[PDB]
Design a protein around this motif. Structure first.
Motif, PDB file in Angstrom:
ATOM      1  N   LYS A   1      45.877  86.805  72.099  1.00  0.00           N
ATOM      2  CA  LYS A   1      45.374  85.927  71.033  1.00  0.00           C
ATOM      3  C   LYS A   1      46.575  85.292  70.349  1.00  0.00           C
ATOM      4  N   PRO A   2      46.442  84.046  69.848  1.00  0.00           N
ATOM      5  CA  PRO A   2      47.506  83.602  68.967  1.00  0.00           C
ATOM      6  C   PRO A   2      47.565  84.565  67.777  1.00  0.00           C
ATOM      7  N   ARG A   3      48.774  84.921  67.383  1.00  0.00           N
ATOM      8  CA  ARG A   3      48.965  85.938  66.330  1.00  0.00           C
ATOM      9  C   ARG A   3      48.259  85.566  65.005  1.00  0.00           C
ATOM     10  N   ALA A   4      48.258  84.286  64.623  1.00  0.00           N
ATOM     11  CA  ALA A   4      47.653  83.926  63.336  1.00  0.00           C
ATOM     12  C   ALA A   4      46.132  84.151  63.389  1.00  0.00           C
ATOM     13  N   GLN A   5      45.528  83.853  64.545  1.00  0.00           N
ATOM     14  CA  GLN A   5      44.108  84.103  64.756  1.00  0.00           C
ATOM     15  C   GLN A   5      43.823  85.597  64.707  1.00  0.00           C
ATOM     16  N   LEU A   6      44.677  86.397  65.351  1.00  0.00           N
ATOM     17  CA  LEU A   6      44.588  87.853  65.247  1.00  0.00           C
ATOM     18  C   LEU A   6      44.594  88.320  63.784  1.00  0.00           C
ATOM     19  N   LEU A   7      45.567  87.843  63.004  1.00  0.00           N
ATOM     20  CA  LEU A   7      45.618  88.224  61.566  1.00  0.00           C
ATOM     21  C   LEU A   7      44.314  87.907  60.839  1.00  0.00           C
ATOM     22  N   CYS A   8      43.745  86.726  61.097  1.00  0.00           N
ATOM     23  CA  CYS A   8      42.466  86.362  60.479  1.00  0.00           C
ATOM     24  C   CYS A   8      41.312  87.236  60.910  1.00  0.00           C
ATOM     25  N   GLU A   9      41.219  87.523  62.213  1.00  0.00           N
ATOM     26  CA  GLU A   9      40.144  88.347  62.736  1.00  0.00           C
ATOM     27  C   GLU A   9      40.228  89.743  62.127  1.00  0.00           C
ATOM     28  N   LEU A  10      41.456  90.263  61.981  1.00  0.00           N
ATOM     29  CA  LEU A  10      41.648  91.591  61.400  1.00  0.00           C
ATOM     30  C   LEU A  10      41.155  91.659  59.942  1.00  0.00           C
ATOM     31  N   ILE A  11      41.463  90.619  59.163  1.00  0.00           N
ATOM     32  CA  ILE A  11      41.085  90.487  57.752  1.00  0.00           C
ATOM     33  C   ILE A  11      39.568  90.325  57.621  1.00  0.00           C
ATOM     34  N   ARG A  12      39.008  89.423  58.433  1.00  0.00           N
ATOM     35  CA  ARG A  12      37.536  89.332  58.565  1.00  0.00           C
ATOM     36  C   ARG A  12      36.849  90.653  58.898  1.00  0.00           C
ATOM     37  N   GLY A  13      37.352  91.314  59.945  1.00  0.00           N
ATOM     38  CA  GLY A  13      36.828  92.572  60.437  1.00  0.00           C
ATOM     39  C   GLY A  13      36.890  93.640  59.375  1.00  0.00           C
ATOM     40  N   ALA A  14      37.914  93.545  58.523  1.00  0.00           N
ATOM     41  CA  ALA A  14      38.119  94.556  57.486  1.00  0.00           C
ATOM     42  C   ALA A  14      37.254  94.364  56.238  1.00  0.00           C
ATOM     43  N   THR A  15      36.583  93.219  56.096  1.00  0.00           N
ATOM     44  CA  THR A  15      35.922  92.865  54.823  1.00  0.00           C
ATOM     45  C   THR A  15      34.435  92.495  54.966  1.00  0.00           C
ATOM     46  N   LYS A  16      34.118  91.686  55.970  1.00  0.00           N
ATOM     47  CA  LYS A  16      32.722  91.243  56.170  1.00  0.00           C
ATOM     48  C   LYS A  16      31.763  92.416  56.262  1.00  0.00           C
ATOM     49  N   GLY A  17      30.711  92.373  55.438  1.00  0.00           N
ATOM     50  CA  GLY A  17      29.690  93.405  55.442  1.00  0.00           C
ATOM     51  C   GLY A  17      30.027  94.672  54.690  1.00  0.00           C
ATOM     52  N   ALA A  18      29.207  95.694  54.909  1.00  0.00           N
ATOM     53  CA  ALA A  18      29.301  96.986  54.242  1.00  0.00           C
ATOM     54  C   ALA A  18      30.711  97.562  54.232  1.00  0.00           C
ATOM     55  N   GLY A  19      31.187  97.869  53.031  1.00  0.00           N
ATOM     56  CA  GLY A  19      32.461  98.548  52.843  1.00  0.00           C
ATOM     57  C   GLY A  19      33.684  97.688  53.122  1.00  0.00           C
ATOM     58  N   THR A  20      34.820  98.374  53.248  1.00  0.00           N
ATOM     59  CA  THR A  20      36.140  97.738  53.411  1.00  0.00           C
ATOM     60  C   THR A  20      37.031  98.630  54.270  1.00  0.00           C
ATOM     61  N   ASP A  21      37.747  98.034  55.225  1.00  0.00           N
ATOM     62  CA  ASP A  21      38.838  98.744  55.896  1.00  0.00           C
ATOM     63  C   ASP A  21      40.130  98.432  55.095  1.00  0.00           C
ATOM     64  N   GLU A  22      40.395  99.249  54.079  1.00  0.00           N
ATOM     65  CA  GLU A  22      41.521  99.038  53.156  1.00  0.00           C
ATOM     66  C   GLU A  22      42.891  99.190  53.829  1.00  0.00           C
ATOM     67  N   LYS A  23      42.999 100.169  54.715  1.00  0.00           N
ATOM     68  CA  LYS A  23      44.229 100.392  55.501  1.00  0.00           C
ATOM     69  C   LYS A  23      44.599  99.168  56.316  1.00  0.00           C
ATOM     70  N   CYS A  24      43.607  98.586  56.986  1.00  0.00           N
ATOM     71  CA  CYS A  24      43.845  97.360  57.743  1.00  0.00           C
ATOM     72  C   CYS A  24      44.374  96.226  56.871  1.00  0.00           C
ATOM     73  N   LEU A  25      43.745  95.989  55.712  1.00  0.00           N
ATOM     74  CA  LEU A  25      44.159  94.924  54.818  1.00  0.00           C
ATOM     75  C   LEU A  25      45.603  95.123  54.356  1.00  0.00           C
ATOM     76  N   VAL A  26      45.920  96.347  53.952  1.00  0.00           N
ATOM     77  CA  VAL A  26      47.293  96.650  53.516  1.00  0.00           C
ATOM     78  C   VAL A  26      48.292  96.408  54.655  1.00  0.00           C
ATOM     79  N   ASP A  27      47.973  96.911  55.849  1.00  0.00           N
ATOM     80  CA  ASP A  27      48.869  96.755  56.994  1.00  0.00           C
ATOM     81  C   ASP A  27      49.172  95.293  57.329  1.00  0.00           C
ATOM     82  N   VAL A  28      48.127  94.471  57.328  1.00  0.00           N
ATOM     83  CA  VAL A  28      48.262  93.059  57.665  1.00  0.00           C
ATOM     84  C   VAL A  28      48.958  92.287  56.570  1.00  0.00           C
ATOM     85  N   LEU A  29      48.420  92.358  55.362  1.00  0.00           N
ATOM     86  CA  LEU A  29      48.887  91.505  54.291  1.00  0.00           C
ATOM     87  C   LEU A  29      50.323  91.745  53.864  1.00  0.00           C
TER      88      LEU A  29
END
Ligand code: CA
Ligand code: CA
Ligand code: CA
Ligand code: CA
Ligand code: CA
Length: 303
Positions: free
Chosen positions: A70-98
């Motif tokens: 994947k282009p890396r910037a698209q990967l970063l977006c998908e990870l952030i989306r995946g971590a937030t959309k819907g029930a709950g939050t993947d907080e570890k993912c957000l911290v790691d990426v951002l």
């Protein structure tokens, strides 16, 4: 030739013994050429590479390989989306990426994120995480802010303020701004200077030890990660990998995003891993990971 690399990918997918060719391809060619290769892949085969990989691979190795192509910037977006959309939050993912992307890379993904999802990256993160916890304040400030150069006078002011913060138990009200200003808004150069000023002024005491003292849990991970990334992205990569290995089993999701996000640029990761944790990276890998997945992780991190 691009059409030949396409053939190599097909065969790596169709032969059990050739699976690591996928990793060799990923590490041997620049991102723009991988992207171009994938376009040729679909033109030739009639199927998207992503769908093709999914049909032939499994488990951790699949998850990893999908991230690399994947282009890396698209990967970063998908990870952030995946971590937030819907029930709950993947907080570890957000911290790691951002906390481990350069300021320009943040600006790039703010723009991309909106194209992909019609959402504001900053809004999405704040909505999911709030702005109460210190890790949350930190990633919000990074998500919406900028890292701007400042005068030496400001560094000298901030030195006294961060020392004060470190000396008091708990994060005090007036200390919040100090931690956020330094860790969310300093440039790498300014952070590195403050890091040096601190140990020089305070008898060899370190900012990183101050972070350890001040914070616990995800707060502590977040501020150490920002610390290490500003000091040297390769340090941050080793720290995040060590954390993913920690405890029984390991966090393959975290290993995958750290490796896909950082293997290409953070060539000093294995050096820092050994220096900090006293065991060669590959030796920790040997006892944590197995088979083609372990071999993949070792090879991506090999400079
Ligand atoms: Ca599959
Ligand atoms: Ca959510
Ligand atoms: Ca304090
Ligand atoms: Ca602590
Ligand atoms: Ca483990």
């Amino acid at each position: 030739g691009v059409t030949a690399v396409v053939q190599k990918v097909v065969e790596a997918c169709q032969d059990e013994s050739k699976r690591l060719d996928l990793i060799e391809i990923a590490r041997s060619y620049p991102p723009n050429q991988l992207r171009n290769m994938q376009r040729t892949f679909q033109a030739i085969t009639g199927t998207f590479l992503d769908a093709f990989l999914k049909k032939h691979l499994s488990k951790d190795f699949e998850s990893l390989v999908l991230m690399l192509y994947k282009p890396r910037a698209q990967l970063l977006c998908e990870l952030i989306r995946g971590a937030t959309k819907g029930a709950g939050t993947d907080e570890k993912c957000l911290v790691d990426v951002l906390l481990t992307i350069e300021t320009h890379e943040v600006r790039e993904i703010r723009q991309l994120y909106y194209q992909l999802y019609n959402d504001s990256l900053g809004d999405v993160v704040r909505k999911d995480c709030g702005d109460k916890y210190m890790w949350a304040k930190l990633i919000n400030a990074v998500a919406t802010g900028d890292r701007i150069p400042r005068d030496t006078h400001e560094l000298e002011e901030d030195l006294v303020l961060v020392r004060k913060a470190i000396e008091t138990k708990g994060v005090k009200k007036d200390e919040v701004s100090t931690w956020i200003r330094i860790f969310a808004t300093y440039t790498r150069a300014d952070f590195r200077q403050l890091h040096k000023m601190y140990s020089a002024k305070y008898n060899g005491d370190s900012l990183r030890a101050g972070v350890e003292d001040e914070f616990q849990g995800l707060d502590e991970y977040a501020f150490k990660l920002a610390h290490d990334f500003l000091y040297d992205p390769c340090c941050a990569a080793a720290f995040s990998m060590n954390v993913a290995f920690a405890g029984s089993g390991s966090d393959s999701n975290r290993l995958n995003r750290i490796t896909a996000m950082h293997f290409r640029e953070c060539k000093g990761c294995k050096y820092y891993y050994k220096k900090v944790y006293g065991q060669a990276f590959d030796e920790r890998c040997a006892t944590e990971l197995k088979g083609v997945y372990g071999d993949a992780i070792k090879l991506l991190w090999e400079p």
